[PDB]
Amino acid sequence: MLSAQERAQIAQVWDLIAGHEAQFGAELLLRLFTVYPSTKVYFPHLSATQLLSHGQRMLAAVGAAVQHVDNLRAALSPLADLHALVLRVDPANFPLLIQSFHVVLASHLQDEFTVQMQAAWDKFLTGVAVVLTEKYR
Amino acid sequence: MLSAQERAQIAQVWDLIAGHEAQFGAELLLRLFTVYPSTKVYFPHLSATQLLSHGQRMLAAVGAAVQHVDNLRAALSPLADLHALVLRVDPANFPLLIQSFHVVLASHLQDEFTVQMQAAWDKFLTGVAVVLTEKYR
Numbered sequence: 001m002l003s004a005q006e007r008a009q010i011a012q013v014w015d016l017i018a019g020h021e022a023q024f025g026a027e028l029l030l031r032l033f034t035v036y037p038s039t040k041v042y043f044p045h046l047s048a049t050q051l052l053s054h055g056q057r058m059l060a061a062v063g064a065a066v067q068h069v070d071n072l073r074a075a076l077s078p079l080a081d082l083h084a085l086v087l088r089v090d091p092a093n094f095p096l097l098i099q100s101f102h103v104v105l106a107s108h109l110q111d112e113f114t115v116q117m118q119a120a121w122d123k124f125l126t127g128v129a130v131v132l133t134e135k136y137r
Numbered sequence: 138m139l140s141a142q143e144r145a146q147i148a149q150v151w152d153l154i155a156g157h158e159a160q161f162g163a164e165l166l167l168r169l170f171t172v173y174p175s176t177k178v179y180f181p182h183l184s185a186t187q188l189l190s191h192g193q194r195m196l197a198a199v200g201a202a203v204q205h206v207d208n209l210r211a212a213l214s215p216l217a218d219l220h221a222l223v224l225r226v227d228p229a230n231f232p233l234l235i236q237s238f239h240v241v242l243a244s245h246l247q248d249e250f251t252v253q254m255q256a257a258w259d260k261f262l263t264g265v266a267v268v269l270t271e272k273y274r
């Protein structure tokens with residue numbers, strides 16, 4: 001449950017990502033793989049231009065989720081099935097990705113990525129992660 | 138157990154912090170308080186110049202720990218007693234601080250804070266946190 005101010009804040013973060021999905025997503029994956037090498041097993045194909053492609057897909061889906069905070073479970077249902085049932089992504093990986101995403105955004109946006117924006121963004125992404133992991137057995 | 142390359146990497150990170158302990162530490166606390174408001178209960182006195190003072194103390198201790206990775210338990214013993222026994226800081230707060238610290242460093246250092254440096258820094262700070270929490274009952 002995001003407040004109106006929090007929804008405005010995550011829209012502001014997204015406006016700073018739009019157009020950079022591939023580059024920011026590739027850097028997110030690189031940071032995740034280096035700081036948490038256990039995550040590399042999920043991406044044997046990516047383990048450099050293929051990084052840009054997957055990064056683009058991933059962050060484009062994040063942008064779509066911003067437009068659907070009120071019905072995230074319905075809108076993300078295919079992606080939830082994919083991560084929980086088909087890919088079998090251990091839910092513990094999702095906080096590692098979210099923390100890594102904050103670092104990449106801070107590196108590019110510096111003080112434009114304010115602590116208020118980070119709090120809202122973290123709440124939003126934690127909710128996305130719940131949807132993408134709750135079907136995991 | 139940090140490798141020689143990892144020790145070189147954390148020395149490089151510290152060289153980029155030195156002189157900015159107060160400012161970076163204050164921003165670390167502000168980010169921690171905003172993204173994780175549950176942490177504010179530990180700092181009723183700080184909850185703005187007092188932020189600079191505490192930030193300075195905290196990050197100066199980090200710098201001292203860099204010089205003592207081989208005998209962290211002995212060198213940090215007073216600080217371990219303080220956090221675990223006197224302040225009773227719940228160990229779950231330490232990952233929140235470490236993640237917040239990466240974000241603050243990225244915001245200021247941008248791509249100079251490389252993913253290799255972050256991996257080494259994270260390993261180092263996770264070890265500091267183990268020392269500062271293992272006495273907690």
Ligand code: HEM
Nearest residue numbers: 039042043054057058061062083087089093094097128129
């Ligand atoms: C907010 C969190 C996440 C979002 C929005 C997201 C989004 C996506 C999307 C849209 C795809 C489709 C790629 C395609 O069909 O080409 C995908 C695939 C994939 N995701 Fe995620 N993902 C997230 C978290 C994770 C995490 C934490 C992991 C593992 C650590 C992961 C591992 C994978 C893998 C292995 C694939 C398949 C890649 C491929 O087949 O090329 N994802 N993800």
Ligand code: HEM
Nearest residue numbers: 176179180191194195198199220224226230231234265266
């Ligand atoms: C790498 C991790 C940490 C380091 C190196 C560190 C370092 C320090 C130092 C050097 C002091 C002494 C301040 C003084 O005597 O004036 C201190 C005090 C304190 N620390 Fe930490 N700290 C760490 C983590 C934490 C965390 C995670 C919390 C709580 C969320 C915390 C809460 C406190 C509090 C409440 C004080 C007392 C402040 C005061 O009395 O003014 N510390 N810390």
